[PDB]
Write an enzyme that holds these catalytic residues in place. Structure first.
Site, mmCIF file in Angstrom:
data_model
loop_
_atom_site.group_PDB
_atom_site.id
_atom_site.type_symbol
_atom_site.label_atom_id
_atom_site.label_comp_id
_atom_site.label_asym_id
_atom_site.label_seq_id
_atom_site.Cartn_x
_atom_site.Cartn_y
_atom_site.Cartn_z
ATOM 1 N N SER A 155 36.583 40.755 38.715
ATOM 2 C CA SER A 155 36.055 40.147 37.257
ATOM 3 C C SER A 155 36.880 40.620 36.076
ATOM 4 O O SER A 155 36.713 40.053 34.987
ATOM 5 C CB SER A 155 34.629 40.275 37.110
ATOM 6 O OG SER A 155 33.911 39.240 37.840
ATOM 7 N N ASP A 165 55.249 47.491 43.053
ATOM 8 C CA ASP A 165 54.803 48.726 42.709
ATOM 9 C C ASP A 165 53.368 49.031 43.105
ATOM 10 O O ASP A 165 52.908 50.066 42.773
ATOM 11 C CB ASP A 165 54.682 48.706 41.213
ATOM 12 C CG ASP A 165 56.439 48.798 40.685
ATOM 13 O OD1 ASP A 165 57.400 49.143 41.146
ATOM 14 O OD2 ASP A 165 56.596 47.986 39.643
ATOM 15 N N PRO A 218 44.672 26.139 44.959
ATOM 16 C CA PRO A 218 46.175 26.806 44.791
ATOM 17 C C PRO A 218 46.619 26.705 43.456
ATOM 18 O O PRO A 218 47.371 27.472 42.970
ATOM 19 C CB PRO A 218 46.810 25.854 45.723
ATOM 20 C CG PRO A 218 45.929 25.325 46.656
ATOM 21 C CD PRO A 218 44.394 25.340 45.999
ATOM 22 N N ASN A 228 35.644 40.063 45.282
ATOM 23 C CA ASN A 228 35.424 41.493 45.507
ATOM 24 C C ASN A 228 34.767 41.930 47.147
ATOM 25 O O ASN A 228 34.346 42.648 47.369
ATOM 26 C CB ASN A 228 34.583 42.167 44.816
ATOM 27 C CG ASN A 228 34.953 41.674 43.205
ATOM 28 O OD1 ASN A 228 35.893 41.859 42.802
ATOM 29 N ND2 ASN A 228 33.703 41.588 42.502
ATOM 30 N N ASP A 254 48.198 34.913 43.140
ATOM 31 C CA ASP A 254 49.206 34.797 42.336
ATOM 32 C C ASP A 254 49.802 36.314 41.870
ATOM 33 O O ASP A 254 50.838 36.316 41.297
ATOM 34 C CB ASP A 254 48.863 33.862 41.012
ATOM 35 C CG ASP A 254 48.955 32.556 41.663
ATOM 36 O OD1 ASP A 254 49.665 31.856 41.893
ATOM 37 O OD2 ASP A 254 47.480 32.097 41.730
ATOM 38 N N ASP A 300 31.119 32.552 31.980
ATOM 39 C CA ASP A 300 30.380 33.456 32.481
ATOM 40 C C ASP A 300 28.680 33.418 32.057
ATOM 41 O O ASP A 300 28.215 32.465 32.038
ATOM 42 C CB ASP A 300 31.332 34.737 31.925
ATOM 43 C CG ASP A 300 31.347 36.096 32.839
ATOM 44 O OD1 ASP A 300 32.361 36.117 33.720
ATOM 45 O OD2 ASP A 300 29.931 36.576 33.123
ATOM 46 N N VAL A 325 45.531 27.051 40.356
ATOM 47 C CA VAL A 325 45.010 27.964 39.296
ATOM 48 C C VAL A 325 45.756 29.416 39.590
ATOM 49 O O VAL A 325 46.529 29.459 40.498
ATOM 50 C CB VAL A 325 43.483 28.026 38.928
ATOM 51 C CG1 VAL A 325 42.853 26.499 38.890
ATOM 52 C CG2 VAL A 325 43.027 28.465 40.546
ATOM 53 N N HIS A 338 28.020 40.862 31.460
ATOM 54 C CA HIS A 338 29.150 40.740 32.259
ATOM 55 C C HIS A 338 30.351 39.909 31.409
ATOM 56 O O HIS A 338 31.406 40.132 31.275
ATOM 57 C CB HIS A 338 28.732 40.222 33.664
ATOM 58 C CG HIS A 338 30.001 39.771 34.294
ATOM 59 N ND1 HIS A 338 30.666 38.671 34.518
ATOM 60 C CD2 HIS A 338 30.641 40.659 35.519
ATOM 61 C CE1 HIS A 338 31.696 38.734 35.418
ATOM 62 N NE2 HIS A 338 31.534 39.846 36.081
ATOM 63 N N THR A 391 56.027 49.646 32.297
ATOM 64 C CA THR A 391 56.694 49.649 33.535
ATOM 65 C C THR A 391 56.469 50.626 34.614
ATOM 66 O O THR A 391 56.735 50.744 35.650
ATOM 67 C CB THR A 391 58.349 49.544 33.451
ATOM 68 O OG1 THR A 391 58.687 50.664 32.552
ATOM 69 C CG2 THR A 391 58.848 48.458 32.828
HETATM 70 CA CA CA Z 1 47.977 29.711 42.243
#
Ligand code: CA
Length: 279
Positions: free
Chosen positions: A224, A260, A175, A161, A200, A39, A177, A69, A16
């Site tokens: 990533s 936060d 939207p 990025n 999200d 990837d 995913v 990566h 937290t």
């Molecule tokens: Ca979404």
């Protein structure tokens, strides 16, 4: 379970508060789940994967990760030391070449591959896909990610990025995913992280220690790196029975640390992935 002196991002997703260094998690650790890492590949022979990783598809002359990566991302999902879900099964799909790039047609094919290939794998607790890739907006790329999610796979994708609205990037802008932004160890939005109403969730993305090719390790940064924290968290929660592939993104957002983060532009969620583990 408690892993002392864990990478800061693991400690963060079970806390937290910022500023701690132990990762706390239920010992089931994603057993019985599967995560596809779409990837540059995965160096499966790396001991950190303990035989739980395997390459299942490549679109190039080799399935070897010649970049690192994909191995780093897979390590954040599920390596023994650097992973969120330390007992999950990892499946590598090499849609990016060893320079880290790939054509959208190949990326689309790899997504549809996962939607079918999961029927060839034993994943009784559920299936996740981690997509630490992206480029400019493409309706075809978004519709492939939407199909993958519709097929019963929890799809986590990097926001990108560009320090810009993720609405202009794919598959970030699809939207349906789970679009993942990046944060740093002081709970700031990472300077490079995209934002916007399509995000999200945020996960740790600045200075993330994980596996690398040649049996090695290194710290690197990006959305990533945030994405596999969320993918691994989903696998972990699906093994615990808390959620399902269709519901995991919403469940993660519902249970996140809320309000936060700093440098969150107005209209972007201030939600940070959290496992709500109580020992
Ligand atoms: Ca979404």
């Amino acid at each position: 379970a408690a892993q002392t002196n864990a990478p800061w991002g693991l400690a963060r997703i079970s806390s937290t508060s910022p500023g701690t260094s132990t990762y706390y998690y239920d010992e089931s650790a994603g057993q019985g789940s599967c995560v596809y890492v779409i990837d540059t590949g995965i160096e499966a022979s790396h001991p950190e994967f303990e035989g739980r990783a395997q390459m299942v598809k490549t679109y190039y002359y080799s399935s070897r990760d010649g970049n690192g990566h994909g191995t780093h991302c897979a390590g954040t999902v599920g390596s023994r030391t650097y992973g969120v879900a330390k007992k999950t099964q990892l499946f590598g799909v090499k849609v990016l070449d060893d320079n880290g790039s790939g054509q959208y047609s190949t990326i689309i094919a790899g997504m549809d591959f996962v939607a079918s290939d999961k029927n060839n794998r034993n994943c009784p607790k559920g299936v996740v896909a981690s997509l630490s890739l992206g480029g400019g907006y493409s309706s075809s790329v978004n519709s492939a990610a939407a199909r993958l999610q519709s097929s019963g796979v929890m799809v986590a994708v990097a926001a990108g990025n560009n320090n810009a609205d993720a609405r202009n990037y794919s598959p970030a802008s699809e939207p349906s995913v789970c679009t993942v932004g990046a944060s740093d160890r002081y709970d700031r939005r990472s300077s490079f992280s995209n934002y916007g109403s399509v995000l999200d969730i945020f996960g740790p993305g600045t200075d993330i220690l994980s596996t690398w090719i040649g049996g090695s390790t290194r710290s690197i940064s990006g959305t990533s790196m945030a994405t596999p924290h969320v993918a691994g968290l989903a696998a972990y929660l699906m093994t615990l029975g808390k959620t399902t592939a269709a519901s995991a993104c919403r469940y993660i957002a519902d249970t996140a640390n809320k309000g936060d983060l700093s440098n969150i532009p107005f209209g972007t969620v201030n939600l940070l992935a959290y496992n709500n583990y109580q020992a």
